Ligand binder design. Structure first.
Ligand SMILES: CC(=O)N[C@@H]1[C@@H](O[C@@H]2O[C@@H](C)[C@@H](O)[C@@H](O)[C@@H]2O)[C@H](O[C@@H]2O[C@H](CO)[C@H](O)[C@H](O)[C@H]2O[C@@H]2O[C@@H](C)[C@@H](O)[C@@H](O)[C@@H]2O)[C@@H](CO)O[C@@H]1O
Ligand SMILES: CC(=O)N[C@@H]1[C@@H](O[C@@H]2O[C@@H](C)[C@@H](O)[C@@H](O)[C@@H]2O)[C@H](O[C@@H]2O[C@H](CO)[C@H](O)[C@H](O)[C@H]2O[C@@H]2O[C@@H](C)[C@@H](O)[C@@H](O)[C@@H]2O)[C@@H](CO)O[C@@H]1O
Ligand SMILES: CC(=O)N[C@@H]1[C@@H](O[C@@H]2O[C@@H](C)[C@@H](O)[C@@H](O)[C@@H]2O)[C@H](O[C@@H]2O[C@H](CO)[C@H](O)[C@H](O)[C@H]2O[C@@H]2O[C@@H](C)[C@@H](O)[C@@H](O)[C@@H]2O)[C@@H](CO)O[C@@H]1O
Ligand SMILES: CC(=O)N[C@@H]1[C@@H](O[C@@H]2O[C@@H](C)[C@@H](O)[C@@H](O)[C@@H]2O)[C@H](O[C@@H]2O[C@H](CO)[C@H](O)[C@H](O)[C@H]2O[C@@H]2O[C@@H](C)[C@@H](O)[C@@H](O)[C@@H]2O)[C@@H](CO)O[C@@H]1O
Lengths: 136, 135, 136, 136, 135, 136
């Protein structure tokens, strides 16, 4: 089966200047119905196709996929190659994780954080999705 | 089940200077066999791993996943951080959408458009795919 | 079903300056259980969310998804827009391939190569995965 | 998926002389996890491999598969060919039903009743099962 | 997936005195949608839980599961142990077959025939069903 | 998935006068490929549509579904209602079992045995089958 969540914050863009990972609002998957299922795995894709980061010390952004149990399943990020980008451009980002649903997990969700004091921005479509399948 | 299409225009590169979204030829999924099925869902991924855009005003490219009846299911894109890039680099792009197959939709396809008068280019492997599952 | 492998070589980072494609250590899928299945397809995703490439002639890196018989299923890459990037930044990369399991192939793996004498680097999470399903 | 329940009441056999259908203890399936699924069907099999019915007017037994709302999905029965069987023998019985899970029903169960004042008996293994699958 | 048909001829009982296998009306599965699929298989169950047969020479009935092109996939039946049963009792019957769906077969159906000049009877619920799965 | 085995011993009928359960030749399912799979269940149907038993003390026959580990999953049987049947008739028999494939099982097979010194006979089509499914 498929679980999916998307956002499209054009009118009210999202930003973070947090050095610690914080949730991205709206990018949460409920896997409640599959908790404690030794027979199931989720393949989770976080898609942030058009982020940018503003700043003056090689800005960028980081993203993670995490469970409600606080387990960080995957992480990565983008950064620019100039110290002070002329105008911070859109750097597409995707992240893929796996999670065994054997444990008592109920949520898989997206998080983000800054780097080198940047501000990370999302102002357009983004999604988190999972394909949940039997291990056989 | 999986549905998949790919292109590899290495001997015949694709480009657009269109300000309006237009189809990327060959990146289309025929979902006719699954349509009119309210309990099926598709999770669609557009993968354009090596695009670039030329131009002189912070060039870039935008992409979308659309139905044959013109509903935009997802969109996004890349841009460079310099007004006139020294040599427009390859900026990998992936886009993920979801679509219920309840309607009489027959095709899900990829579209592209330019940014600030750029020309967007694909000259190598790219794909569109879907995983189609019961709810 | 899902097949999955990930690496997180933070303590012992990976790199290549190979002009020719070589395996990325650890990013291999074992599909031998499904070899020669006439009605199964795999959708394979190579996710390298945080690579970079150092060098001084428009550096970058190329990636491919390949079978153990040497068939290249997909390929692509990233490159910077300056000849000599001030400090080569993180350029997220994802690649999707399809593979019919109607084959005696037993392993699918990730490969990489350099561009214009660059060195490509992975020093954090990366994954390769497949969703395997019946064509009907 | 499979849902299953069996009984083996060798030490504490079951019987009924009820003219009206009553539940067979223990032969119930819990389908509440699938309640109100619009695209799922269950193929239900009631297997009573070793029943008999005692009595002196062409005895036998009837069985049904019923929802917790009282809907009879299937029914059938066995009877002997003599008015007064010399010693009522074991007459294997199987019954198959279909059930759409597009319903708020939470339990499917087996029922039994007598014939012509018989007593029906189960003193060994019996089962009720369902295979649950998506219609597509 | 599941395919299923049932009958309940309580107000219009069925019977046969045919020595040759003949169709039981209504116990047929349309497998057209799955045909020409070499990698699909059907597991078919015929369930006739309450049949009986009348007659005076050890009566009984035989059943088969057959394709529309006349291939017999399974067969079996019941009989009484007395030459002239006092009153022909209900003898539950179930039959299970397998069929590859590689061919252009469109129907799998139930058939019946008599034994030693009997008349076979169905006057209540009966079904035919299949579970259809990838190999 | 489906596993299936059938016999049709018209030319060379099968019989047993064993009071202990013995294998029915040819009614064996190989579940090797699913051993040690906590995520899988098998629903197993033994179908002996046309058996009979000869004898002079209420003859009949018993059948079981058993694993290679010697676990008896299900059992049942038929018997006649007269001490000495005029001519032992065909008494259709079906048996349904479930097995969790979490254990190291490789075969599920059919067995039979006599009762009260009878001889059990099969001279026509019979099958054993399983539907194997994810528990979710
Ligand atoms: C202060 C200012 O005018 N800056 C503009 C910048 O616009 C600002 O940021 C955008 C995202 C939006 O919130 C504006 O309201 C805001 O003023 C320009 O950004 C473009 O703005 C247009 C709308 O006018 C679109 O939103 C477009 O997508 C924006 O460009 C994208 O986002 C930028 C931050 C870069 O990543 C660029 O590559 C993208 O295409 C930019 C355009 O060059 O110019 C000034 O900096
Ligand atoms: C050679 C040097 O000192 N340059 C630093 C650089 O650190 C070097 O490279 C990183 C990858 C690591 O191996 C260091 O041991 C090494 O000194 C800085 O890179 C950052 O280093 C910090 C730790 O000090 C973190 O590891 C951080 O993630 C690194 O930045 C990332 O990787 C870089 C190569 C760039 O892609 C950057 O955009 C990333 O965020 C950089 C930081 O600007 O500064 C000097 O160049
Ligand atoms: C009342 C009596 O003594 N009659 C016996 C009968 O035993 C009775 O019924 C069985 C079911 C059990 O509850 C006994 O305690 C009770 O005495 C015999 O039945 C067999 O009994 C043996 C044990 O002694 C086994 O239990 C065996 O499975 C029984 O036969 C089966 O059940 C019968 C009711 C018939 O359906 C028969 O065909 C089965 O095989 C019978 C055996 O012929 O003999 C007296 O009638
Ligand atoms: C010794 C004798 O002639 N007995 C017959 C019996 O035939 C014997 O058993 C059958 C199964 C077969 O192996 C014969 O070669 C053997 O002689 C009759 O059984 C029927 O035989 C015909 C063939 O001539 C068919 O095989 C038919 O299906 C048999 O009847 C079935 O099996 C019986 C054992 C009973 O269960 C009956 O109800 C079945 O229909 C019988 C027929 O009444 O008559 C003599 O007993």
């Amino acid at each position: 089966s498929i679980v999916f969540a998307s956002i499209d914050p054009r009118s009210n863009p999202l930003q973070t200047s947090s050095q610690n990972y914080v949730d991205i609002p709206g990018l949460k998957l409920d896997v409640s119905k599959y908790s404690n299922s030794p027979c199931l795995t989720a393949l989770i894709t976080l898609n942030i196709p058009t982020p940018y980061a503003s700043g003056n010390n090689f800005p960028g952004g980081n993203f993670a996929i995490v469970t409600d149990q606080g387990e960080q399943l995957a992480y990565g990020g983008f950064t620019y190659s100039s110290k002070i980008p002329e105008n911070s451009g859109r750097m597409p980002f995707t992240l893929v994780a796996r999670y065994s649903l054997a444990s008592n997990v109920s949520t898989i969700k997206a998080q983000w954080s800054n780097i080198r004091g940047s501000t990370v921005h999302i102002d357009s479509y983004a999604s988190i999705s999972a394909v949940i399948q039997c291990n056989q």
